[PDB]
Each structure stands twice: as C-alpha cells, then as structure tokens.
Curated annotation (Swiss-Prot), chains A, B:
GO MF annotation: an example: N-acetylgalactosamine binding
Entries under Gene3D superfamilies matching the protein: Jacalin-like lectin domain
Listed name of the protein: Griffithsin
Residue ranges of every copy of the Jacalin-type lectin domain listed in the record: 1-120
SUPFAM superfamilies: Mannose-binding lectins
SMART domains, sorted: Jacalin (SM00915)
Length: 121, 121
C-alpha cells in the first residue's frame, strides 16, 4: 500500500525532502538534477535551478514522453513556473491540482522515464 | 493519498530522488539533512552522511518521538544501517517491511516531526 505516516509533535514549519530541480535539455531531457544530484547524460543545455520556497510545491506538471522524457514543465502552488524544457516529440500528459512528493526515474544518456509520486487533490 | 504515475520508456538505470541523509543530534534530533539540505536547528552533533546505492532503500525504520523526534535509526534492503542517533526520550515506533519513498517533516530549532512516505508490504 502507498501511504504515509507522521511521527512527532505539532510544532515547527513544514519542509519537503524534494528541494530543487534543474534539467539538461535539447530535443529531449538529457538529465534531471534533483537536490543537485545529476541523473542522465551531459548532452543539451543546463537549465537554471528551481528551488522550492517554504510551503511551495509542484501543483501542476506537464510531461511529454515517448521512449524518453521529451519535455517537462511545471507550476507551483505559488504560481511560479519551470520550463517548458526539451522538445516537441512524445505525447503530453498532465497532472493538475496535485502536491508532488518525490521524483524517481530511470536514466542513461538521456532521461528515459520518470516515476512521480504525488497527492491528487 | 499517495499515488504514482510513470512516464517514459523502458531504458536506462533506475534512480531515486532520495539520495542522502545525515542528522544533527544530542538528546533529540536537532536537524535532518536530506540530500544536503539542512532542516532544523544548530544544536547537537553532526552525524556521518548515509548515501543510498542503486536499488537501495530504507526497509525498516525506528523513530522515537514525543513533542519532537527524539531518535532515528534505519536499515536498508541491503542490510546497511544508519543510527541510532539521538536520545532515549519519547516512545518508539517502528516501520517494518516497507520501502521509504520520501522524507518530509516539520522543523524549528529541532526536528519536530517526520512525514514518511512509503510503500507498506
Ligand atoms: C545540436 C543540439 O542542440 N544537440 C542536442 C543534444 O545536445 C541533445 O543531447 C539532444 C537531446 O536533448 O538534443 C539535441 O540533439
Ligand atoms: C512514434 C513515437 O512514439 N515516437 C516517439 C517520439 O515522438 C519521441 O520523441 C521519442 C522520445 O520519447 O520516443 C518515440 O521515438
Ligand atoms: C548501454 C546503455 O547505457 N544504454 C542506455 C539505454 O538503456 C538508455 O535507454 C539510453 C537513453 O538514456 O542511453 C543508453 O543508450
Ligand atoms: C551539550 C550538548 O550536547 N547539548 C545538546 C544540545 O546541543 C542539543 O541541542 C540537545 C538536543 O538534541 O541535546 C543536548 O542538550
Ligand atoms: C511526557 C512526555 O511524553 N514527554 C516527552 C518526552 O519524553 C520527549 O523526550 C519530548 C521530546 O519528544 O517530548 C515530550 O516532552
Ligand atoms: C516560532 C518558532 O519558530 N518556534 C519553533 C517551534 O514551532 C518548534 O516547535 C521548536 C522546536 O523545533 O522550535 C521553535 O521554537
């Protein structure tokens, strides 16, 4: 079962383990960089890093994909936008009104796949 | 509710967004450092950093907590261990036969709470 459980008290301010995203991109996503850790090849161009503020999370995302990840864009609950980055290949899929919790995937020379964990609202 | 969607193809090698964990601890967990990002206060002592290998994840975890997180230990599916770090206050809760996907939480001067997102087998 996918779930989650909270341990501890009621104080403090929320934080997320997913703190920043950048990509290398061209016609595809050559790489995704999650909390600074690089996944994929050295092709394409490196995007600026998007760093989530306090209480900020990805709320909407559009991913184009086929055999690889062709393109990513997202918007946060604070209305900030990342991308689009990549090309116009693949087919588009959108997450709307979510809170992204984690981003896993698979990669080689390019970013082959993404496994996005999220809450759907 | 935690859910997931995969996008892309079958190639490449798998990665996870959750790459490393360290803590600062004394009687409590003063901070948790996730993929190099510090959450919590300046108290306690800095632990070594645990870095996940390929295919490696937390499969068992013990958290002592009360108003704050008092102590954490975990074990991976590969038989590696992190901790125990912290003190003997609060009461223990253990997750077993899981796969930890992400670690969120709330922090001030200490680590108040942990929100663990995981698959429960
Ligand atoms: C000339 C140019 O821009 N080449 C890029 C290459 O760097 C990148 O690896 C690939 C996949 O994104 O997209 C283009 O082919
Ligand atoms: C016919 C078809 O599905 N073509 C897709 C292409 O649009 C996409 O750019 C590429 C990388 O994801 O994967 C396939 O080759
Ligand atoms: C031998 C090897 O590394 N093959 C990978 C392949 O699995 C992956 O699909 C592709 C794009 O990331 O990059 C390389 O070609
Ligand atoms: C002398 C010493 O080690 N003091 C530590 C303090 O730094 C830490 O903030 C607290 C909670 O973990 O535990 C101890 O009191
Ligand atoms: C009566 C009680 O449960 N006290 C707990 C204590 O054991 C724990 O060390 C602290 C930090 O979590 O939170 C409370 O003060
Ligand atoms: C206003 C503020 O930041 N207060 C926080 C409190 O919420 C948290 O419970 C505690 C332990 O982390 O540290 C601070 O006191």
């Amino acid at each position: 079962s996918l779930t989650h459980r909270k341990f501890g008290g009621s104080g403090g301010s929320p934080f997320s383990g997913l703190s920043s995203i950048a990509v290398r991109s061209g016609s595809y996503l050559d790489a995704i960089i999650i909390d600074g850790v690089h996944h994929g090849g050295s092709g394409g161009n490196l995007s600026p890093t998007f760093t989530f503020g306090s209480g900020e999370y990805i709320s909407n995302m559009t991913i184009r994909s086929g055999d690889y990840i062709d393109n990513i864009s997202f918007e946060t609950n604070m209305g900030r936008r990342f991308g689009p980055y990549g090309g116009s290949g693949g087919s588009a899929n959108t997450l709307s009104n979510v809170k992204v919790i984690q981003i896993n995937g698979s990669a080689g020379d390019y970013l082959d796949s993404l496994d996005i964990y999220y809450e759907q609202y």
